[PDB]
Design a protein around this ligand. Structure first.
Ligand code: HEM
Ligand SMILES: *[C@@H]1O[C@H](CO)[C@@H](O[C@@H]2O[C@H](CO)[C@@H](O)[C@H](O)[C@H]2NC(C)=O)[C@H](O)[C@H]1NC(C)=O
Ligand SMILES: *[C@@H]1O[C@H](CO)[C@@H](O)[C@H](O)[C@H]1NC(C)=O
Ligand SMILES: *[C@@H]1O[C@H](CO)[C@@H](O)[C@H](O)[C@H]1NC(C)=O
Ligand SMILES: *[C@@H]1O[C@H](CO)[C@@H](O)[C@H](O)[C@H]1NC(C)=O
Ligand SMILES: O=N[O-]
Ligand SMILES: [Ca+2]
Ligand SMILES: [Zn+2]
Length: 595
């Protein structure tokens, strides 16, 4: 009927239908449709894109173009009036560790990245957006409202660049603009291994045939490995401390250095690979490098899948888990495994779970030195604090022993992200992630709040009194109505995040539906789902049932006291046990004898 062919990246690699291992690109997962859930393709559209001109321009682009007859509010104004708060006292989640926040971010980076556009190589267009706050082409600046403190110290706007779109990088489309997913849609450790062959090979330790990943040679961690440095310049991790001059790390995912606990999580995954691979080699001395790498990569992918679906999702979705993600029934080649455009906003519920400080703790899980607790904003693109301030062990104790922020209708996003965010190319701790999220919703042509309520079979408030009942909050509903005029116009990120949480979950009804549908699809539409008969043996699944974040720590750090349930709020030493009492990963079922 139409032309579902459009594609410049058209990697169309040769599919080995006999391959026991994933491609890096995610091609060849679906036999009938080989590019399905592959990287560098369009994000899936669950609903048609909504742009000001029907094609590509965001709502808010043209000041004289209403949405449903109302001006859309400035992203930064919604952020100041609704998302911001002063008092960090009483904000912490009494039953979620900081690792619950951190694992969310890890799983997100595995599933989606819509990278900002670039046109040429060296343009004035780049700085002209920052410098002159001029809207045009892929410059879509976040303008400050009249009373904004940042107007006094930071100029007229926050620079913002439109997300890249599929087919051309620069020329527009006759159909609607579709944003790219740069990573594999499968939950497959693409953030450890990469989603492009090139990056994927640039990262491996080929030198030895042991199937190990490439490590920092310039620096080490009390025996244990560092991610290699990206020695590309200019380095944002260098720029935040020109003295220490420590570059960003080099991971499967370009975002790995964005904050120090992400860099930490990633470090442990570079590690557990090698712990697994070496264990494989001891157990299978005949196996070559490929076999150890590919088999190592496949055990790590299975680890992330299990932690995500057994430990993480049930305490996000709560009473709604069983409704959207019922027990697995095997692989369904008819399920669309693509990450949706809306999911990339839904999964940003995580921004409301980030607390204002990060701690380094000791063996007695006590403050580590005199500057043990640090403000989050000092830790963006910060690699020097890991290398020159005691490696990742003290940060990992913090992940276990400290708590996530709880989402709160009156305390949504900490000022560490809402006012002090650091972005590369940009020299300030002065960005607003909430404002960015709202601007990006529009950039991506997102349907409004009630389109999504409708999509999920939920009520669609049309008046102030309607909104008050759905949000169970008069003041929040009144502020949203003063800004948006109609609930139809509420940006999905703030609409979804404003809903009271479901019984025993950390998101409201709308997000539970959007997140739950996506997670159900990425499991059921995945030919390499760990539990799909023929991916792993009866005996391996008995032994993969064993895996744990508690054990991943024990086995790749010098930490010897851990919680059993590492995502729940754990207080030392009362809710902690010694590592010996924690089920280990019995690799005996990977034992190969072919003689
Ligand atoms: C300190 C922690 C974090 C920082 C500094 C951070 C920062 C960012 C930034 C700068 C973006 C890009 C925004 C844009 O340009 O539109 C982003 C996107 C995102 N963040 Fe966060 N974030 C954090 C934690 C989390 C957590 C905990 C989650 C989930 C549980 C999460 C999920 C996402 C998702 C899904 C996106 C969109 C990814 C895409 O491009 O497809 N983040 N984050
Ligand atoms: C790939 O792995 C090899 C073997 O594990 C690494 O070579 C070793 O490097 C360290 C320090 O550079 C030495 O302490 C070991 O004794 C070396 N062993 C051997 C057998 O060479 C090599 O550095 C790794 N390569 C990269 C680029 O990360
Ligand atoms: C830069 O790092 C050095 C250690 O290399 C540290 O002593 C110094 O305090 C750092 N400065 C800043 C501003 O972070
Ligand atoms: C496979 O997926 C499609 C679409 O979700 C569904 O209609 C079909 O019945 C599924 N097959 C099974 C056995 O569930
Ligand atoms: C804390 O969370 C866990 C799930 O991780 C749950 O089983 C437990 O009941 C919760 N504890 C409290 C005190 O609410
Ligand atoms: O995508 N990082 O939050
Ligand atoms: Ca992936
Ligand atoms: Zn700047």
């Amino acid at each position: 009927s139409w032309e579902v062919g459009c594609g410049a990246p058209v990697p169309l690699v040769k599919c080995d239908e006999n391959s026991p291992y994933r491609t890096i690109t995610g091609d060849c997962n679906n036999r009938r449709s080989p590019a399905l859930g592959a990287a560098n393709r369009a994000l899936a559209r669950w609903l048609p894109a909504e742009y000001e001109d029907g094609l590509a321009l965001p709502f808010g682009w043209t000041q004289r173009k209403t949405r449903n007859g109302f001006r859309v509010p400035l992203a930064r104004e919604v952020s100041n009036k609704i998302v911001g708060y002063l008092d960090e006292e009483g904000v912490l989640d009494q039953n979620r560790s900081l690792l619950f926040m951190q694992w969310g971010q890890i799983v997100d980076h595995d599933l989606d990245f819509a990278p900002e556009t670039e046109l040429g190589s060296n343009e004035h267009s780049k700085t002209q957006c920052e410098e002159y706050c001029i809207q045009g082409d892929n410059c879509f600046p976040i303008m400050f409202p009249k009373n904004d403190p940042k107007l006094k110290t930071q100029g007229k706007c926050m620079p913002f660049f439109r997300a890249g779109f599929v087919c051309p990088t620069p020329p527009y489309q006759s159909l609607a603009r579709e944003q790219i997913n740069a990573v594999t849609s499968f939950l497959d450790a693409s953030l450890v291994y990469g989603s492009e062959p090139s990056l994927a090979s640039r990262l491996r330790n080929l030198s030895s045939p042991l199937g190990l990943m490439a490590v920092n040679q310039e620096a080490w961690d009390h025996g244990l490995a560092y991610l290699p440095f990206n020695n590309k310049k200019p380095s944002p991790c260098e720029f935040i401390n020109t003295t220490a001059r420590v570059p960003c790390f080099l991971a499967g995912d370009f975002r790995a250095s964005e904050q120090i606990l992400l860099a930490t999580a990633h470090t442990l995954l570079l590690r557990e690979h090698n712990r697994l691979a070496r264990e494989l080699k001891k157990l299978n001395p005949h196996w070559n490098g490929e076999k150890l790498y590919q088999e190592a990569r496949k055990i790590l992918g299975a680890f992330i899948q299990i932690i995500t679906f057994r430990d993480y999702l049930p305490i996000v979705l709560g009473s709604e888990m069983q409704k959207w993600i019922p027990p697995y029934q095997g692989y369904n080649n008819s399920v669309d495994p693509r990450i949706s455009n809306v999911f990339t906003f839904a999964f940003r519920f995580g921004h409301m779970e980030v607390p204002s400080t990060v701690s380094r703790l000791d063996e007695n899980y006590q403050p580590w030195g005199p500057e043990a607790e640090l403000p989050l904003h000092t830790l963006f693109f910060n690699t020097w604090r890991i290398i020159k301030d005691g490696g990742i062990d003290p940060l990992v104790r913090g992940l276990l022993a400290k708590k996530s922020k709880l989402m709160n209708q009156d305390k949504m996003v900490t000022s560490e992200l809402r006012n002090k965010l650091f972005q590369p190319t940009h020299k300030i701790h002065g960005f607003d992630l909430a404002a960015i999220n709202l601007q990006r919703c529009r950039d991506h042509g997102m349907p409004g709040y009630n389109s999504w309520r409708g999509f999920c079979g939920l009520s669609q408030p049309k008046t102030l009194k309607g909104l008050q009942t759905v949000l169970k909050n008069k003041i929040l509903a009144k502020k949203l109505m003063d800004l948006y005029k109609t609930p139809d116009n509420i940006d999905i990120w703030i609409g979804g995040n404003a809903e009271p949480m479901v019984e025993r979950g950390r998101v409201g009804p709308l997000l539970a539906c959007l997140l739950g549908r996506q997670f159900q699809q990425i499991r059921d539409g995945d030919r390499f789902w760990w539990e799909n008969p023929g991916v792993f043996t009866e005996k391996q699944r008995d032994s993969l049932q064993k895996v744990s974040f508690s054990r991943l720590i024990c086995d790749n750090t010098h930490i010897t006291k851990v919680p059993l349930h590492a995502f729940q709020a754990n207080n030392y030493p009362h809710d902690f046990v010694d590592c010996s009492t924690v089920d280990k990963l019995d690799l005996s079922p990977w034992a190969s004898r072919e003689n």
